[PDB]
Design a protein around this ligand. Structure first.
Ligand SMILES: [Fe+3]
Ligand SMILES: [Fe+3]
Lengths: 151, 149, 149, 148, 149, 150, 157, 147, 148, 150, 150, 148
């Protein structure tokens, strides 16, 4: 996809690439939490986590395709993703409160990156900014549904 | 209940979870970055490879957990245990297919070991491995038939 | 037919029909009577268990009938052949879960014996028992996961 | 008082037992039915079973919503119900007569629930009236086959 | 017509409209502000209670309008005729359940009054109240079972 | 982590949106039930869709507030203090129902436009919620109003 | 052979259903035919809204005829709703050709009014006799009362 | 007016007979008895839903061309007759009675196809489509008596 | 014989142009219609547009299926068609009359196709017949509103 | 190394299954069109369901052989050479169509059991394919034959 | 009382169409399973759609014959005597699968046109069946052949 | 402020015209496309067409909802619009290139709308941004085919 302004494409890649890596990692780590969660709220949190993962897969895809449509590649191979990301999700079985605290922590780091994209794209490309804004609304809502459980 | 039955099954199935889950991530990579004369049909087919891979990853991982054992499928553990030929950047559809087929071949090696090895251990977990192997053998053919020429 | 092939399946699949269909009735009982902080999630979870049990009971019974033998699964015969831990009246969700898992664990013994017993005799009926065991093992995990810690 | 909750359980409890028993004995007929009408009757019996399970759930939960438990364990249900459904294979005409006989007994309980709840609780009465409309229709779909 | 039939419908169903419509708004209040260990299940359950209450308000109101009489359920009038135990802000789920159960109990008084009052007047409008009462009694149990023991 | 000031300022802009939208649900139903006249079925139906949109908008705005970590007071008593309606008490011709609901919508549009201008310097994510609500509300207003054009 | 289960299990309750629901079936079934006539022939400024609203009134009337008829038959007595009988037992204000939508509405409401009289008589006559059949009449009266309002509201005020 | 007139001449009998078939097929559906009850009760409902569609299609064809249709119950009854029994009947007899009503409708359908042929091929297509469906329905019914 | 394809192209091409034009001009009437019947007519015109797009597709694909190109570019379509749809806001009665006038012109061409394909290609003729059935019905749905 | 015997065995054991399932589609359609008598609608529909299942089993078996890298010859001419039907050439009573279809099914079950036996030692993934087809076909058989238990 | 000529003409002109469409299901599946090369997935899928359409057309044309009171013989053995295919025995490139399929479709179209012309004086209802099948087959043929336009 | 509605009409009007023209020229390309990618490109063009028709409706109804008419008659649309889509049969690479060219022109107008609405009306700006996001994506799906 060409195109007209290499500066617009370069800004989208710069601000949206970290969003892709963190959303795609949240699919893999969210799956881990969903399989390994235990305790009194299992079925609800098991299912809430699968929701979060479905959302994160869709956000990863939207952000990535926005980049590619502007004519730049994205490297989101597993090795790259793992170099660029970190998770607090436990290695094995864990009580639901603890999986929520871990997922909320990964969500918090994605939000830092989404907010950086919103500010960064504001004077360069409002169309790519809108992608980060839409992702941010969905993630802020997921974060509330997770965290409401701990209050 | 024999805990070595569950542990042995987890040992056969864990590589399948790691490889299927990496196939989801690396297939998305190929789905985003593919170019060339067959773009739309391959971009769509890779997405359906990915959706199958995610299901197979879920089926295998929840067999392990149903057997009572945890599964370490964190991003960090997955990268340590898997490797991909999917290119880093834009690539022609033939090259994307070849690389996804190579990742699949390595998954089929672990599925065949799981099928052989579960035969003496746990037939219900064997069946999970056969079911994933049927589906994966079919994706492999859909991909490879494009290069037959 | 081979007269033994049919007789082996009635013998191994019959107790699965009886326990699966008893699990529909006692599942409903738990579903109606369950109380406490997790009511809505467990009320629905149990409904899902009942729906699976009903499907599994049909699949096993219809496999037996397809091979040409009758099945006696009247209320009276089922009560003779089955037992339940589900309480008579209101009970906290933890206790409903333990009671149903107990009932499942008994079904699992009969499924595993059908899997072992069908192995050199009728692989088509063995597949029925395997397919039912997979779903029952998963329903047991969803129930049991609630009681960890 | 609610002696009003107690009346629901008295009049609706029989309904839960007979409907729930109809799910099991209905499935028995469905599996074991034979002969020239197999597929229409096998299907129709599966439809009667689905209805029965719904009615059992509606009656039971009406009782629980009022505050009283229900004992519908397999043992209690067997003690309080009887079936004419044959132990094994049987012609479609015989399965019908057996099932209609099981329906006729439930209908007796539903009518006693309608009459009994009339001066006590119209909301529970309405549950038994709803179930009786469905069970009356099921009985006709079955029995019209033998009309002949 | 006989104008006393429409008049008794409006007299006994109007409070059902006001309290069902109020339960939609105050239900949404509790749905948004609910907090604690059971959040997702209770947040969803309350949304279902709100959807039922909206349907019930509609059914009762259209029965009145179909008999030829108007209904005043503007916000101002509905606020004069109803009150709520739902808190102004964030609250634990046990407290939201108790507040909403309180509101349901007042609507139940009015439903039973309609059922009794419409019995020698209009059995078609009586049936509308009976249908709403069946749904509200079930909703009430779903909420209240979470608090039991 | 994240500026409580931003959240607090955003809740202030969105809170009137929630009260006005939730009131349009109740007032719109009022109009839906009591509307009369030659256009009854079309307008009775349009009002139902207006009510269903309004309820979604109330839910999106309120959920945005709570996602920012703040409570929302939308009890009936509070909503009645902060809102008023032109919808008649009883039976009304469809022309009069449209003019009343348009007047209620117009007042919502004032709060919406204030959210949009004010959130531009506070939170663009919250501002997008208000923009999405105003696009739908604007459209609903035209569908109502086009009827009176002649 | 045989003979066995009775087909008409309660002949007095059967007879009450047939006595009170038969007129319901004939008028509901007639409403389907005459509703379609109005649906086809309606003209004027409200054409499309009215054309469609008449189509739902027709679909309701068909389902109510079916519910009423199958209640009678389930209880064990036949129903004669052949075209010749329904025509003897029913009449319509619906015009023979094209008619403006207000006049179609008035005609349909007049046919619904005659149906409502039969439904109220059924609700009253089944009251001490068969509450299950009564419930069928109540359910139909609720939906017919609502369709009457939808039609009639158009002519207010 | 010529095409409108031809449409009215040929499709009007189709409307009357299809709408009658709805009412008389409903009668057969309620009152059918016998070893084949469920399959025939359900098959008769499907014939009734087709007949209602066919009436609606033929009727709107006439009206779209500018002529009214009188399909009130009194007019339909004056123009149609049925062999459907007044009460309970065995399914073999409901099928013979319904196939009789259908044979009558087929004669009017074929007349409409022959008569619209020099006049209006678009109205003629309505008659053909109805006939295809009604021939199929007649076969589903009649196959049951083939032995 | 290449003259089957040529006849279809000859009789179906004006049908594609007028149906495609009706999508655009009907969208125009859809956006700009005002007055007491707004929502009903705004919806009805969307439905006319959806049908017209389908008719255009069916006719054009019949031509291409027979082996011949179709020139339905905007520029060509505009040379070949005219509309009475007003430039701006108009009352619903006026939108209906202007769309009925564009439909009447489409009917002249459909009828010429039906007559012209009669001795040549009954399969292409069936395409014209099917489109004409649907457009005759649309015209009535519009016009009935003005009967009074 | 890779192993060709796994593929050749699948083709050996699954190919009769493809041809017999595919011929059942065509002969089952024949019985479906030409069936007559007291049970016509129920049998006519039943047979359509058996044909839908048979088409699925053919596809499943074929694509298994293809996925393993080997071609399948299932042209009409080849299929006709390798298969045979008891279905009558013209109209037949439903009891006779049922007997003819059950006979075609019985022959296909012989090949499925040979495939299940033959694949046990060689390729359990393909064996599974045959087991799944056999469960469906065994059940189709019963639904048909139950009508003759009379 | 029914004209024996109407039935006989429909059997005469529609029976070849049933044989050719039913064969196209079988040979189309063969092409679907065995196709290869750069357009695999798009043609694999396009062939399944042509197979489904061919099955629907087979059904429609056969049911028209039986509705008129005549049986039809579409057993595998008869269908094979009466049809032939160019679809290859094994793996083939997608260009050659398209060409083969088009060739089978061209043979069906000559029979469709013969039905349309021959039913014109006898039975317009049966001619309509042939007309409808021909519109769909002419479209399938275009979708296949346009790939070879380069 | 009627300067708002006037801004939306100024900036959104070229969007309505070029999207609506893309429907007609997109159908032309979809009908006439040929070559080794026929079915995938035939289907992709139908999807671009369906998006374009929705983008046109969204932009036009934004203008109308603000209280201004829109002239999108065929004749006005043709005056304001140009296509590079060939008159007849063309290879899929040429149709892609022609359509992409038509999409590039729409994107200039979309960008002018985004930039021009920024200080006037953020609600109409958002319409243009949403349209631009979908149009950028469709352009990529088309153009990725030509990367070799
Ligand atoms: Fe999972
Ligand atoms: Fe919400």
């Amino acid at each position: 996809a060409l195109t007209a302004d290499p500066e617009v494409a370069a800004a989208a890649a710069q601000f949206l690439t970290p969003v892709v890596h963190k959303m795609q990692a949240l699919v893999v780590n969210g799956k881990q939490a969903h399989w390994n969660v235990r305790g009194s709220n299992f079925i609800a949190i098991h299912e809430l986590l699968d929701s979060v993962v479905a959302h994160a897969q869709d956000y990863a895809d939207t952000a990535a395709e926005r980049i590619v449509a502007l004519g730049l590649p994205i490297d989101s191979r597993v090795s790259t993703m793992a170099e660029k990301t970190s998770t607090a999700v436990p290695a094995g079985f864990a009580q639901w409160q603890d999986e929520i605290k871990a997922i909320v922590s990964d969500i918090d780091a994605a939000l830092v990156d989404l907010q950086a994209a919103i500010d960064g794209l504001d004077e360069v490309d409002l169309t790519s900014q809108d992608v980060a804004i839409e992702i941010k609304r969905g993630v802020d809502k997921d974060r509330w549904f997770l965290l409401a459980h701990l209050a």
